Amino acid sequence: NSVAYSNNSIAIPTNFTISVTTEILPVSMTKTSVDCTMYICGDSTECSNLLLQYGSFCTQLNRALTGITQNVLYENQKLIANQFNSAIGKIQDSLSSTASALGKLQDVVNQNAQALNTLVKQLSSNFGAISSVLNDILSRLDKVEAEVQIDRLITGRLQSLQTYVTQQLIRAAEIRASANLAATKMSECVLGQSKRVDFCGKGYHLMSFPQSAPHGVVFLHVTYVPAQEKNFTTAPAICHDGKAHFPREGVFVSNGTHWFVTQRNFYEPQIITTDNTFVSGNCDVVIGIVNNTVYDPLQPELDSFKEELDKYFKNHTSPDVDLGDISGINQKEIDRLNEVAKNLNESL
Amino acid sequence: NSVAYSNNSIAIPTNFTISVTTEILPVSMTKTSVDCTMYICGDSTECSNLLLQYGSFCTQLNRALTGITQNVLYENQKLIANQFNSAIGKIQDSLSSTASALGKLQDVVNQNAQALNTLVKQLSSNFGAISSVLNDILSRLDKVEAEVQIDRLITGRLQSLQTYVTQQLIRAAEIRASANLAATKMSECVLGQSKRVDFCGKGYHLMSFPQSAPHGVVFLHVTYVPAQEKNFTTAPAICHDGKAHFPREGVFVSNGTHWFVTQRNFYEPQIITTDNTFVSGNCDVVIGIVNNTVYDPLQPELDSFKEELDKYFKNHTSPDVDLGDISGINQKEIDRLNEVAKNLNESL
Amino acid sequence: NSVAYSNNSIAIPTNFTISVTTEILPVSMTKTSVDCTMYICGDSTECSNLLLQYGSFCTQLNRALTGITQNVLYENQKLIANQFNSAIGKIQDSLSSTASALGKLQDVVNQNAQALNTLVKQLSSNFGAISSVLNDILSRLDKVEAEVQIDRLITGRLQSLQTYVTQQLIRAAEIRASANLAATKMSECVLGQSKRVDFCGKGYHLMSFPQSAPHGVVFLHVTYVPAQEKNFTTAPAICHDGKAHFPREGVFVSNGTHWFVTQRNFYEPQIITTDNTFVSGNCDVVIGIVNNTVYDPLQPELDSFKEELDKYFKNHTSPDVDLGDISGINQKEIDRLNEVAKNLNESL
Numbered sequence A, B, C: 001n002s003v004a005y006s007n008n009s010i011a012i013p014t015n016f017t018i019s020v021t022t023e024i025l026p027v028s029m030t031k032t033s034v035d036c037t038m039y040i041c042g043d044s045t046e047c048s049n050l051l052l053q054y055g056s057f058c059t060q061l062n063r064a065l066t067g068i069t070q071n072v073l074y075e076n077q078k079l080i081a082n083q084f085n086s087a088i089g090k091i092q093d094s095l096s097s098t099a100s101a102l103g104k105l106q107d108v109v110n111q112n113a114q115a116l117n118t119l120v121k122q123l124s125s126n127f128g129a130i131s132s133v134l135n136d137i138l139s140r141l142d143k144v145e146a147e148v149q150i151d152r153l154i155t156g157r158l159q160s161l162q163t164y165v166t167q168q169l170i171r172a173a174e175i176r177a178s179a180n181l182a183a184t185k186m187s188e189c190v191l192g193q194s195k196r197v198d199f200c201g202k203g204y205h206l207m208s209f210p211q212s213a214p215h216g217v218v219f220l221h222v223t224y225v226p227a228q229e230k231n232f233t234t235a236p237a238i239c240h241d242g243k244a245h246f247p248r249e250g251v252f253v254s255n256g257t258h259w260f261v262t263q264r265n266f267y268e269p270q271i272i273t274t275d276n277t278f279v280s281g282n283c284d285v286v287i288g289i290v291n292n293t294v295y296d297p298l299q300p301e302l303d304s305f306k307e308e309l310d311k312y313f314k315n316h317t318s319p320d321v322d323l324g325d326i327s328g329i330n331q332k333e334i335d336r337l338n339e340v341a342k343n344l345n346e347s348l
């Protein structure tokens, strides 16, 4: 017998004061369209120009927000002439061979001088080519290492603008429920008179007059409130000898000695009769349970970042460049010939 | 005495026509799950393959959406032989030294020819190594400067899909309120009979019959509307000699000469009595104010992009590459020897 | 004459059991603020350090969630001496010219040896410079090709956190409607007594007692339910000889032979009178239609990715680097002079 038969002091209106309410409801929302450049980047031109490559995403967000003795002296004469004539013929061999040698040395040394001027013109091409191609690799890699940091901050400002768009759609879906509240609260109280307590102004409803506002409706409700009220002890129902008895359109207001079915909204007692009450059987309480679970969503739970990275990420490190190490590739006779050019006159 | 005692013409139902309403409410939403590849990238394979590195974000969005004389001639003979014998010994010095010199020149010139063929084989290695390593730097930097632009557009299409997911969750949270409206509107009008005006069909409620639809409930409401109605002047309350008097379950319908408490929803006058009215004291109006602020959120206001960039951004520019500038490193005797090889025969 | 005059079996409460409901409503939501590092990246330090360059986006999401014979022998003596004296003067020419030649060869060969040591010191500079500058291009391009893949996965986890923030704002905008339901359901049933069926506990309302919970209100409603009920055939209205007749605060309960206006919520018949019914004219049904379109949004439809890419995307491919191809730039007299240095003694 838990609560259905407990008696507790309940305020019941003793008397009334006449009153009026001004109740304001928003029924529409002005279309807060957003320029996506000025929101995310603002004045800053390098990120602005990057925004064009994010596509027409801005428009897409605005679809949402815009909706919603003479012999031996002579034989010595033969001898010395035969020694000389044979010597000079050996001088011509000695000298012709030296000319044929020194003329092959002067050939090959000038062919080497040609080869080194060929090498310098080709290597001037290589250090000039590498100058231009490697300056471009440096100049463009500096651009790409800048842009990847500005894209980072654009992408975190995208989420700030997506929180803006979500909170601006959330509010517009509350506004469209407040326009349904303005529909029922117009109907039941401008076309009718409500029997509900505090719907259509504080207290109990008499009459109403709607007036517009720029995005709203405002109600003038004329109502009566309890100027004074008294706590009577009560029960919702009473179980006499195993039968439960309970009101019809009232409560059991409790006098010191008797039960009366007062109207809930006023102290005006009337006697228990089979026309003021309903009746039951066996004196039992049915117990009901209601649990209004507003929806608790499947929230997007994720692995640790290491697992969702390592699934596809490649930690490729290019090797330390090594190339060819070219540091590993490592007068006396003219004095005499000048001396004997003089000292041969000592044998003239 | 603002509005509680003003009298204005109010329509009160003179007569009724019987009527029926068909009222359609959606109570459920079919689960519009989204393939995230086909939404963002579609057929285009380069961005598709990029989508795998954005992780299982697609699934995460689908958790949401799937929920929700013889002596001097002889001394001259001694003389000339002594001059010749001494000259030939000086020829052997002159010639042996020239051989030892020209043999050091032919050594060093071929050691130079060896050094230059060593240099060309090592430099062929360097321009071959730099050919491969610098072609890879070019070929991969072209890939990374392409991918960073395709990632840009994927990331702006992510926001278009996040606006899709937000507007699809927003609608499902309206659907779950329309399923609460279908619960109260089933209960009060299929199990009951409502006293509210225009809830459960236009006019005043008699009876109802629910029927299903694929994701909805449809109500047949049987109701009566005012076929005809008349404007009576009225007041919600009247203050006689400083006491306010007001109805009990009606309005003061105003006849040319008398006040009657008509039932709000019908013209049927009854006389003012202490059983048709309540009474007050001192003739004052209580004024109440209600302002239904649907929530205006803390929207995500940000610095200018320059401040949120400059906090972490580094404007590092790599220097213009300069390297070594190798352009800054800058027969008559054989004719005679051929001539005297001939002209020495003139002294044979 | 579609449904307003059809008769069908309707359950009308025959008798009552007293009952109580416990009804739980959440009225507030605890502020589930999110650390954005730990959500997206977790422990993993390389992506954590990247999060700082996405800006204060985390805060921005938390603004949302924290809200919400002697002569001829002598003439031969003159002859041979004149041949010798003339020969030696031609030896001095032959030898002085060879010295002046071999001294220009030893000059130019050592000037070549100087030029090649100049070249090796300058090229050691170039392969040392390119070693450092090209190692940095390799080492930094490896960093940028890593970061662009970790940013990809951060940006797909951003959407998972934006689905988290959207579903956490969606639920908080249901909570604020359940706090409006707790306001009307407190007012009409703790301050009043509702005439609605199943609002404020199963069945019909007597009385209520609210109790708090940590983020909620719980109502004890005391109510009566139909212990027993009987199906009477009924009609909402009847059209006698072309006039429609319908109840006042009841239904036409159908007895085997007569119509009675029973109270909708109880079987207690009363006779048709002009005080139990309203009356009409011409016997016609008005048909109304209501279609509660919960808002179907302008969803963000996009081009195929190829069109939104090709609008701005540049498919720039850098050319295959070609540079200078340096592979296209391509003793007997000393034996004799050693032999005649010996064999000239055969003419001494």
Ligand SMILES: *[C@@H]1O[C@H](CO)[C@@H](O[C@@H]2O[C@H](CO)[C@@H](O[C@H]3O[C@H](CO)[C@@H](O)[C@H](O[C@H]4O[C@H](CO)[C@@H](O)[C@H](O)[C@@H]4O)[C@@H]3O)[C@H](O)[C@H]2NC(C)=O)[C@H](O)[C@H]1NC(C)=O
Residues within 6 Å of the ligand: A291, A292, A293, A296, C024
């Ligand atoms: C009305 O519906 C509400 C849901 O819409 C219910 O709220 C739920 O209440 C339960 C129990 O209090 C709660 O379960 C978890 O609560 C803790 C918060 O996560 C969690 O730590 C608990 O886990 C502990 O207890 C279990 C069970 O013994 C153990 O197995 C665990 O090892 C651990 O010790 C528990 O799992 C729900 O989270 C909560 N949901 C919501 C949405 O609030 C109301 O209880 C319900 N009221 C009535 C009267 O039915």
Ligand SMILES: *[C@@H]1O[C@H](CO)[C@@H](O[C@@H]2O[C@H](CO)[C@@H](O[C@H]3O[C@H](CO)[C@@H](O)[C@H](O[C@H]4O[C@H](CO)[C@@H](O)[C@H](O)[C@@H]4O)[C@@H]3O)[C@H](O)[C@H]2NC(C)=O)[C@H](O)[C@H]1NC(C)=O
Residues within 6 Å of the ligand: A024, B291, B293, B296
């Ligand atoms: C019911 O509640 C509503 C809020 O839920 C109130 O709406 C608010 O109304 C005020 C005043 O009209 C408004 O304040 C600002 O309005 C302008 C829009 O931003 C703004 O420019 C104003 O600033 C100007 O005025 C102030 C004050 O003199 C000066 O200091 C400024 O320098 C400037 O000149 C003002 O700050 C709110 O924005 C608005 N809020 C919303 C959510 O609409 C209703 O007024 C209220 N109604 C009643 C009858 O109480």
Ligand SMILES: *[C@@H]1O[C@H](CO)[C@@H](O[C@@H]2O[C@H](CO)[C@@H](O[C@H]3O[C@H](CO)[C@@H](O)[C@H](O[C@H]4O[C@H](CO)[C@@H](O)[C@H](O)[C@@H]4O)[C@@H]3O)[C@H](O)[C@H]2NC(C)=O)[C@H](O)[C@H]1NC(C)=O
Residues within 6 Å of the ligand: B024, C291, C293, C296
């Ligand atoms: C209450 O309002 C609802 C909207 O709030 C209405 O629902 C709408 O119903 C219509 C018709 O059933 C539907 O139109 C399209 O339905 C199909 C789904 O996209 C689509 O394939 C259809 O296209 C076909 O038919 C047209 C017309 O013949 C042809 O031109 C086409 O070539 C094709 O063959 C059709 O365009 C709406 O989508 C739907 N909207 C929603 C939000 O559900 C209810 O019908 C309405 N009820 C009453 C009783 O008025």
Ligand SMILES: *[C@@H]1O[C@H](CO)[C@@H](O[C@@H]2O[C@H](CO)[C@@H](O[C@H]3O[C@H](CO)[C@@H](O)[C@H](O)[C@@H]3O)[C@H](O)[C@H]2NC(C)=O)[C@H](O)[C@H]1NC(C)=O
Residues within 6 Å of the ligand: A315, A317
């Ligand atoms: C991808 O390659 C990265 C190198 O390019 C690598 O980073 C390296 O990680 C190891 C192990 O964590 C570190 O080794 C040392 O780490 C700390 C730092 O002092 C020491 O206390 C430890 O004792 C250990 O010796 C390297 O220092 C670190 N190198 C760099 C440049 O960061 C990543 O771990 C690799 N990731 C994957 C998934 O393979």
Ligand SMILES: *[C@@H]1O[C@H](CO)[C@@H](O[C@@H]2O[C@H](CO)[C@@H](O[C@H]3O[C@H](CO)[C@@H](O)[C@H](O)[C@@H]3O)[C@H](O)[C@H]2NC(C)=O)[C@H](O)[C@H]1NC(C)=O
Residues within 6 Å of the ligand: B315, B317
């Ligand atoms: C980061 O470094 C950028 C250079 O790589 C630098 O851009 C340079 O900005 C200056 C000042 O705005 C510009 O200087 C000239 O700008 C206009 C352009 O004609 C002139 O009218 C001015 O009188 C001025 O002389 C440079 O032209 C510009 N260079 C480039 C290549 O864009 C950024 O400003 C630097 N940013 C930060 C935050 O340090």
Ligand SMILES: *[C@@H]1O[C@H](CO)[C@@H](O[C@@H]2O[C@H](CO)[C@@H](O[C@H]3O[C@H](CO)[C@@H](O)[C@H](O)[C@@H]3O)[C@H](O)[C@H]2NC(C)=O)[C@H](O)[C@H]1NC(C)=O
Residues within 6 Å of the ligand: C315, C317
């Ligand atoms: C941007 O440049 C890309 C090259 O860097 C280019 O990719 C190339 O596309 C063509 C045409 O689709 C492919 O050609 C062959 O494609 C398949 C592959 O076997 C064959 O069956 C076909 O018959 C055809 O011969 C190239 O293979 C492909 N190259 C690479 C490296 O992917 C893009 O198409 C260019 N995009 C734009 C928009 O210009």
Ligand SMILES: *[C@@H]1O[C@H](CO)[C@@H](O[C@@H]2O[C@H](CO)[C@@H](O)[C@H](O)[C@H]2NC(C)=O)[C@H](O)[C@H]1NC(C)=O
Residues within 6 Å of the ligand: A009, A011, A229, A231
């Ligand atoms: C009976 O009604 C009176 C008011 O008419 C209640 O008095 C209030 O009680 C609360 C709770 O102790 C106090 O905080 C207020 O200051 C009291 N106001 C006055 C004017 O006395 C009283 O609590 C009610 N009795 C019961 C049992 O609810």
Ligand SMILES: *[C@@H]1O[C@H](CO)[C@@H](O[C@@H]2O[C@H](CO)[C@@H](O)[C@H](O)[C@H]2NC(C)=O)[C@H](O)[C@H]1NC(C)=O
Residues within 6 Å of the ligand: A341, A342, A345, A348, C092
């Ligand atoms: C060898 O001696 C002769 C003398 O017989 C030199 O001939 C003279 O050379 C000088 C120049 O050095 C001239 O001015 C004279 O006119 C030359 N004299 C005659 C007679 O012709 C010859 O120069 C000497 N050679 C060497 C290498 O000492």
Ligand SMILES: *[C@@H]1O[C@H](CO)[C@@H](O[C@@H]2O[C@H](CO)[C@@H](O)[C@H](O)[C@H]2NC(C)=O)[C@H](O)[C@H]1NC(C)=O
Residues within 6 Å of the ligand: B009, B011, B229, B231
């Ligand atoms: C009394 O009721 C009549 C309708 O029965 C109202 O007449 C309408 O008044 C509006 C406002 O001027 C006009 O736009 C309509 O065309 C009128 N309809 C007809 C049929 O006349 C009249 O306004 C009501 N009087 C008051 C004071 O509200």
Ligand SMILES: *[C@@H]1O[C@H](CO)[C@@H](O[C@@H]2O[C@H](CO)[C@@H](O)[C@H](O)[C@H]2NC(C)=O)[C@H](O)[C@H]1NC(C)=O
Residues within 6 Å of the ligand: A092, B341, B342, B345, B348
């Ligand atoms: C010097 O004169 C002699 C003659 O005494 C030349 O010897 C002749 O050389 C030719 C070839 O040029 C041969 O055909 C003859 O058979 C040789 N004659 C004899 C007798 O041997 C010699 O060639 C001359 N040298 C120069 C350099 O003119």
Ligand SMILES: *[C@@H]1O[C@H](CO)[C@@H](O[C@@H]2O[C@H](CO)[C@@H](O)[C@H](O)[C@H]2NC(C)=O)[C@H](O)[C@H]1NC(C)=O
Residues within 6 Å of the ligand: C009, C011, C229, C231
């Ligand atoms: C009259 O009321 C009774 C219950 O008092 C209804 O009986 C139920 O009918 C449904 C539909 O066939 C069955 O699934 C249940 O098993 C029945 N319950 C019992 C206890 O019999 C009956 O359907 C009602 N008649 C009409 C026309 O609605």
Ligand SMILES: *[C@@H]1O[C@H](CO)[C@@H](O[C@@H]2O[C@H](CO)[C@@H](O)[C@H](O)[C@H]2NC(C)=O)[C@H](O)[C@H]1NC(C)=O
Residues within 6 Å of the ligand: B092, C341, C342, C345, C348
């Ligand atoms: C040419 O013959 C002379 C002899 O008249 C050689 O002179 C001798 O040389 C040897 C060394 O080879 C010395 O040991 C002797 O003392 C030298 N003798 C004299 C008398 O001085 C000369 O060496 C020979 N030259 C060649 C090239 O065979």
Ligand SMILES: *[C@@H]1O[C@H](CO)[C@@H](O)[C@H](O)[C@H]1NC(C)=O
Residues within 6 Å of the ligand: A005, A006, A007, A233, A234, A254, A255, A256
């Ligand atoms: C209800 O109140 C009366 C007096 O007002 C008292 O006699 C009675 O015992 C109360 N009910 C219960 C169950 O105590």
Ligand SMILES: *[C@@H]1O[C@H](CO)[C@@H](O)[C@H](O)[C@H]1NC(C)=O
Residues within 6 Å of the ligand: A014, A015, A228, B279, B281
């Ligand atoms: C309450 O109403 C009665 C009924 O007229 C009246 O007699 C009494 O004086 C009123 N109370 C006050 C405090 O005015």
Ligand SMILES: *[C@@H]1O[C@H](CO)[C@@H](O)[C@H](O)[C@H]1NC(C)=O
Residues within 6 Å of the ligand: B005, B006, B007, B233, B234, B254, B255, B256
């Ligand atoms: C109310 O209407 C009556 C006539 O219908 C009029 O005499 C009376 O003055 C009106 N009330 C006011 C406050 O003017």
Ligand SMILES: *[C@@H]1O[C@H](CO)[C@@H](O)[C@H](O)[C@H]1NC(C)=O
Residues within 6 Å of the ligand: B014, B015, B228, C279, C281
């Ligand atoms: C309105 O109802 C009354 C009551 O029967 C009737 O006499 C009158 O003719 C009705 N008015 C019209 C226009 O039918």
